[PDB]
Design a protein around this nucleic acid. Structure first.
Length: 290
DNA sequence: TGCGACGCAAAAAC
DNA sequence: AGTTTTTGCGTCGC
């Protein structure tokens, strides 16, 4: 009834079918590693502005809640939360050096203001985009919002246990313990070490995330989860790493910038999950029906 | 059909 | 060690 896989950090992922077994909402059995991500493609090259060295980039994503591996399918539930986390790494550039340097896109050089991640959901069979929604912990007693673009600096991805432990922290002492894992506070660096043109100082806010954490995410309530044939639709979750540039023939999205003007989120790399099945609100999707 | 809404219930968080 | 918080899902009614 429960199939267990050992995670990289020694925790377990426990896959179970909610058609057959109902587990408490806050049970640790609800936390588990989801489908592995695969490269879709690389897009615009990035180079360091004097050396000309190409920056090696890699998205490092993981799903930590919401998806079970059941009979060779990855299965989520429309009504339930998923968590998708991601960092990126620069294999050829240590963070401290990276933040002091400056980088251009090779398209013809556009200066990179900052790096950022966004997530998307798609129908994996036809590439149609599907809306995602997020809640706060307060859920219906708080606002709903769409996943946002997250400025980030390169970092290793925290272990599954760390994401679990940090999921519902409010206590200040505990927040302090995790702060260095999730944030870089630019206002605490020695400004004299940095040039005006440095990458660190073109990030939009002083508090810069090291990890993009999309928690309490759902597929939009309007999604149709079956095809007309009654076959399940296949969905995929996508993580895109971009460079944000000043807009003043390559893939990009427009972005509401800090100064008000219309930025460009230029695509650098994209990864996606294998096909996902989403179970809808039908009673037959729940053990309560049996 | 199935969706927005209301809120029970059970373990985490403190 | 009691209270509050968080989140899967049972249910009503349109």
């Amino acid at each position: 009834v429960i199939l267990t896989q050992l995670n990289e950090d020694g925790t377990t992922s426990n896959y179970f079918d909610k058609r057959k077994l109902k587990i408490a909402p806050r049970s640790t059995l609800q936390f588990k590693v989801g489908p592995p991500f695969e490269l879709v493609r690389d897009y615009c090259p990035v180079v360091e502005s004097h050396t000309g060295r190409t920056l090696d980039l890699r998205i490092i994503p993981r799903i930590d809640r919401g998806f079970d591996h059941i009979d060779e399918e990855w299965v989520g539930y429309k009504r339930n939360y998923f968590t998708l986390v991601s960092t990126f790494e620069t294999a050829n550039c240590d963070l401290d050096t990276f933040l002091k340097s400056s980088f251009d896109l090779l398209v013809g050089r556009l200066r990179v203001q900052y790096f950022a991640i966004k997530i998307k959901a798609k129908n994996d069979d036809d590439d149609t985009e599907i809306n995602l929604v997020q809640h706060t912990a307060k859920r219906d007693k708080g606002p709903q919002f769409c996943p946002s673009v997250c400025p980030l600096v390169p970092s290793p991805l925290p272990k599954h246990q760390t994401i679990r432990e940090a999921s519902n922290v409010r206590n200040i002492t505990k927040m302090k313990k995790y702060d260095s894992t999730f944030y870089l506070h630019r206002d605490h660096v020695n400004y004299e070490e940095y040039g005006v043109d440095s990458l660190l100082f073109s990030y939009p806010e002083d508090s810069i995330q090291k990890v993009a954490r999309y928690e309490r995410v759902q597929f939009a309530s309007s999604i149709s989860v079956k095809k007309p044939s009654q076959q399940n639709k296949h969905f995929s979750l996508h993580v895109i790493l971009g460079a944000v540039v000043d807009p003043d023939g390559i893939p990009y999205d427009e972005l509401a910038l800090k100064n008000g003007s219309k930025g460009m989120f230029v695509y650098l790399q994209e990864m996606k999950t294998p096909p996902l099945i989403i179970r809808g609100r039908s009673p037959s999707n729940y053990a309560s029906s049996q």
